């Protein structure tokens, strides 16, 4: 429909202009970078470099490309200045087979990066074994051969070095043991799964290991279930918990890094549901505020009650669970429920991914399909 497209372009233009006008009363920080190629994935690397005698530091982000088969794809590392504000630079490009659907660094060895790539292969790169800019086609340290179709689920086990979980559109979850010692710069190793789960009946959208329990894996799917897997058990059995969490597709799961029982799901039904693992079959609460499918989900690494979500409504929302149930005035209620702390409306296309900065409080990096990287911080008046 042409009229729909005309209206969408007009409303995005008007909303952006209204957003820019109110930025000074919303943010302590907004940095905008136009990327040469759009990225489906983003993750802060864990290192921070103070520049002494200066009011900034240097931090780094993992990006990828998705040319869609035209040109060479790349895993990239961007260096960004942050106030203790201005520049970005791609400090490393590593050739990559196909779209970078997701990229994640190994928590115990940040120079190792796993990706989800061409036709379902996952890839391992040791970025210290690659130059800053390389001529040819991809030469990964390892290809993980297992999925038969492209995928977006990818998570390292933070309590078992080299243990990786993937999930893809073939409805399969793979578990892997990546041993970096066998790597060389010469040739690509072939790794195959140590276990496969066939526990979903539709695309597997997200997997995540429990941060404090090495054998607990959570997964969510287009089949509308949230499942909790015990990784020590018979892979052919049913998962210990199958939860009918939403009535529409579930795109993301996120386990709270402070409260071991608290878990969030994000769904095409426009909501985020909260779950307690000790009564997993009815939800604790529904976070309502998005106007379209919710895709991205990440707990704050610094504050137990703070959750961020992103949506095809082009907003990133920050939720403060301590404000649940709090009395509102009618004029305040016009903005939505009280637990909706902050809305970031600076993007102008669909949000691909976002990531909380681990070295700065209240800093998010978020990407949209129109090549825009934004690094922002809501005003301390709002969150203090």
């Amino acid at each position: 429909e042409l009229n729909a497209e005309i209206d969408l372009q007009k409303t995005i233009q008007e909303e952006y202009k209204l957003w820019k006008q109110n930025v000074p009363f919303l943010y302590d920080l907004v940095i905008t970078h136009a990327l040469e190629w759009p990225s489906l994935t983003i993750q802060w690397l864990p290192d921070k470099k103070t520049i002494p005698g200066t009011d900034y530091s240097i931090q780094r982000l993992i990006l990828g490309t998705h040319t869609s088969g035209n040109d060479q794809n790349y895993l990239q590392i961007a260096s960004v200045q942050l106030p203790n504000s201005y520049t970005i630079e791609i400090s490393q490009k590593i050739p990559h087979d196909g779209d970078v659907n997701r990229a994640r660094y190994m928590p115990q060895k940040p120079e190792i990066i796993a990706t989800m790539g061409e036709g379902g292969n996952a890839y391992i790169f040791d970025t210290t074994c690659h130059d800053a800019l390389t001529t040819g086609e991809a030469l990964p340290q390892a290809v993980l051969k297992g999925h038969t179709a492209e995928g977006f689920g990818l998570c390292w086990n933070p309590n078992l070095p080299g243990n990786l979980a993937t999930g893809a559109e073939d409805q399969v979850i793979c578990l892997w043991d990546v041993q970096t010692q066998s790597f060389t710069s010469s040739e690509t190793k072939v790794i195959s799964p140590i276990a496969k789960y066939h526990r979903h009946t539709d695309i597997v959208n997200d997997v995540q290991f429990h941060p404090q329990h090495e054998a607990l894996l959570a997964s969510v799917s287009d089949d509308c279930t949230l499942q909790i897997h015990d990784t020590r058990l018979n892979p052919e059995e049913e998962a210990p918990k199958v939860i009918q969490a939403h009535s529409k597709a579930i795109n993301a799961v996120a386990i709270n890094p402070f409260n071991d029982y608290l878990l969030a799901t994000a769904s095409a039904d426009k909501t985020v549901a909260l779950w307690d693992l000790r009564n997993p079959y009815q939800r604790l609460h529904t976070l309502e505020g998005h106007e379209d499918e919710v895709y991205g989900l990440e707990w704050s690494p610094h504050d137990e009650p703070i959750l961020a979500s992103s949506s095809t409504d082009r907003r990133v929302c920050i939720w403060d669970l301590e404000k649940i149930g709090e009395e509102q005035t009618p004029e305040d209620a016009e903005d939505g429920s009280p637990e909706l702390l902050f809305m970031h409306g600076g993007h102008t296309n669909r949000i691909s991914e976002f990531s909380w900065c681990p070295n700065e409080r209240w800093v998010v990096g978020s990407l949209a399909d129109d090549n825009i990287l934004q690094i922002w911080s809501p005003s301390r008046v709002i969150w203090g």
Binding site: N22, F25, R315, D332, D335, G336, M343, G345, I382
Partner: peptide, 14 residues
Amino acid sequence: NRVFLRRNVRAVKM
């Protein structure tokens, strides 16, 4: 369709 929360601006402006 809110692009920001007005109560946020009210909090920051004053």
